Amino acid sequence: SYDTVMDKYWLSQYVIARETYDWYTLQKDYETVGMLSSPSEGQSYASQFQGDKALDKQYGSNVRTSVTIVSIVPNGKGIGTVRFAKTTKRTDGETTHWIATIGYQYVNPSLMSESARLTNPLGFNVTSYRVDPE
Ligand SMILES: CCCCNc1ccc2cccc(O)c2n1
Structure with a gap:
């Protein structure tokens, strides 16, 4: 109930x-992914925005x-499944x-700063x- 709903929320937030x-929300999304990812998943994600062919440099x-969530299934064992669609346009x-x-976990929130917990x-x-x- 509480856990399933909450897992779906964060799994949803992460995927989005x-x-x-x-372009205009990239830095916020980037830092959000980062804050919510392990160091290894972070650098894996961040690799898209590194080099001469970084997404940002290449798309401006x-x-x-855009992302649309279709369904989310937290398999209750640290693995969540998120079906979603992606739409791309040219501005x-x-x-x-x-x-x-998605492999995921909750770490003791007390191990963060207050800002981090926001x-x-x-x-x-x-x-x-x-x-x-x-
Ligand atoms: C083609 C979709 C494959 C999913 N992999 C990723 C992973 C991270 C991303 C960050 C910004 C824009 C994307 O299309 C991204 N796509």
């Missing part, structure tokens, strides 16, 4: 943050990828569907992340 490309404000675009398998009250933490076509 991770799979959205929007001329592209937007009705192509729409594709996806399945995100972003991550439960210590939600994504240990692994993979997204496959459907």
Whole structure:
């Protein structure tokens, strides 16, 4: 009940943050992914925005990828499944569907600063992340 709803919330929040490309919210989404990810999942995500072919450098404000959550199943054992679709346009675009398998946990929220808890009250933490076509 409380746990399932709360897991769905954070799993939802993470996917939206991770799979959205929007130049004007990129920094916030980026830092959100970071705060909610393990160091390894963080650097994996961050690699998209590194180098001469970084997404931001390659898309600027001329592209937007919106995310729509279709369903979420926390398998109760640290693995969550998120079915979602992505729409990309050039500033009705192509729409594709996806399945995100997410390893995640909650770390003791007391181990954060207060500021950190405003972003991550439960210590939600994504240990692994993979997204496959459907
Ligand atoms: C083609 C979708 C594959 C899913 N992988 C990712 C993973 C992180 C992302 C961050 C910003 C924009 C995207 O299209 C992203 N796509």
